[PDB]
Design an enzyme around this catalytic site. Sequence first.
Site, PDB file in Angstrom:
ATOM      1  N   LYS A 120       7.591  35.539 -67.369  1.00 40.05           N
ATOM      2  CA  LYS A 120       6.930  36.689 -67.974  1.00 40.05           C
ATOM      3  C   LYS A 120       7.396  36.918 -69.406  1.00 40.05           C
ATOM      4  O   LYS A 120       6.579  37.205 -70.286  1.00 40.05           O
ATOM      5  CB  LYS A 120       7.174  37.967 -67.155  1.00 40.05           C
ATOM      6  CG  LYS A 120       6.559  37.991 -65.805  1.00 40.05           C
ATOM      7  CD  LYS A 120       6.662  39.417 -65.230  1.00 40.05           C
ATOM      8  CE  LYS A 120       8.079  39.886 -65.056  1.00 40.05           C
ATOM      9  NZ  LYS A 120       8.692  39.244 -63.909  1.00 40.05           N
ATOM     10  N   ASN A 143       9.312  45.008 -70.828  1.00 41.30           N
ATOM     11  CA  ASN A 143      10.615  44.652 -70.302  1.00 41.30           C
ATOM     12  C   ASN A 143      11.512  45.899 -70.247  1.00 41.30           C
ATOM     13  O   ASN A 143      11.198  46.969 -70.786  1.00 41.30           O
ATOM     14  CB  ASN A 143      11.226  43.533 -71.142  1.00 41.30           C
ATOM     15  CG  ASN A 143      11.304  43.874 -72.644  1.00 41.30           C
ATOM     16  OD1 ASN A 143      10.281  43.945 -73.332  1.00 41.30           O
ATOM     17  ND2 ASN A 143      12.529  44.046 -73.158  1.00 41.30           N
ATOM     18  N   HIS A 188      12.328  39.371 -54.298  1.00 45.83           N
ATOM     19  CA  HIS A 188      12.200  40.811 -54.090  1.00 45.83           C
ATOM     20  C   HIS A 188      11.846  41.083 -52.633  1.00 45.83           C
ATOM     21  O   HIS A 188      11.097  42.019 -52.335  1.00 45.83           O
ATOM     22  CB  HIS A 188      11.153  41.415 -55.033  1.00 45.83           C
TER      23      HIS A 188
HETATM   24 CL    CL Z   1      10.950  34.519 -68.931  1.00 46.31          CL
END
Ligand code: CL
Length: 442
Positions: A120, A143, A188
């Site tokens: 990401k 972030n 997760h």
């Molecule tokens: Cl990354």
Amino acid sequence: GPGSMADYQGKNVVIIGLGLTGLSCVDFFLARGVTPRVMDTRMTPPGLDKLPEAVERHTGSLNDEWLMAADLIVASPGIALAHPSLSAAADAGIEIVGDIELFCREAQAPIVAITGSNGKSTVTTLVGEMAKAAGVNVGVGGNIGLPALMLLDDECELYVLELSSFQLETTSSLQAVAATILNVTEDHMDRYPFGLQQYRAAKLRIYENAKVCVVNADDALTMPIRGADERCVSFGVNMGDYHLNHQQGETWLRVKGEKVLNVKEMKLSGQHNYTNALAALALADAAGLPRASSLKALTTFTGLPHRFEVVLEHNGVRWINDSKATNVGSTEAALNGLHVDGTLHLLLGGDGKSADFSPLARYLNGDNVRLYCFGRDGAQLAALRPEVAEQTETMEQAMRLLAPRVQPGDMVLLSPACASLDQFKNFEQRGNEFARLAKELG
Ligand SMILES: [Cl-]
Ligand SMILES: [Cl-]
Ligand SMILES: [Cl-]
Ligand SMILES: [Mg+2]
Ligand SMILES: [Mg+2]
Ligand code: NA
């Protein structure tokens, strides 16, 4: 309804979380003439330091009566909607949103939205650099260190957001000009007790009302819930709208059947970073950014540290810092398609978090692989193939074993598949120490 004029004045607004994200929520409401209440389960969250005096706060637990009195609950992504206090508020019909939902209601420029298990930050940063190369006043964030709400500004011409599954769970108003799920790998588990498809379902929200969906042709879980549709553009290693072409030592990025760039013009290396570059180019194209400046950005972008980062190339040995790889899926992405002319010296270890390392085994056969395993769970990693493995307590000890053994053609790869916290403050410190030792030993 309010329409585009969401107005929070007069409302009892309750924020859960005093990290930077929750603080960005406090700032958002103060800027709009609302003094919210805030709570955090930690007795002494660091962000307490930064609150104005007028903001009522409750720390050490959640305050149920505050939640149940709220007109609006703003939940930081670190608390599960499944927490019984939040589930009780939802069952009472109290509106629960997150920071990204507040952001999407107020954003006055197009949003490029990026989620996925791995990659990401690289893709988000790279789309941002593509926009900067076009002269666009782009706002890049999402972030933990740059909360989206801090980006809001009428001068912004494009937003590029990294979004987590947790943020997406509380987001209903996102209408991305281009959105991607880069990949979905087991991760997760604590927050998704019904497994991989529940984790996926959170990420799939990113495609709702997206104009273009950039999907991973190699990962079916990144397809929209009802399958590929006319909005979908794919990236992949061997095929797709955006893919890689390899012939006789050369590799090119290829788009719609046309080579567009020889990767020798780029500063990134590694198959996964090349597919990240493809995803970024697809998102930029879909957002309307000029192709020529987006290619220029591919030639100048250095990459982020710790993401398959070449920290030393000397005497024919590439020392690669992939300390961002804190789980098995990330290390799998580093090993897949890996090209090494000589021997791979692979550093594995740390706190493995009781993970199944079985998926790595298929990459560790062949006569040109050596393992150097360290940290809490080093023995579990060496067990993947004991005959080619050394085990030490620390990364430095492991690197001192391999350094006298490397030859031109070799790769030294730190892709540890584990968290760093048994021995380091965080994965960045682990990568920085690897870089320091590579320069000492290489
Ligand atoms: Cl990354
Ligand atoms: Cl634009
Ligand atoms: Cl870590
Ligand atoms: Mg402001
Ligand atoms: Mg243990
Ligand atoms: Na508004």
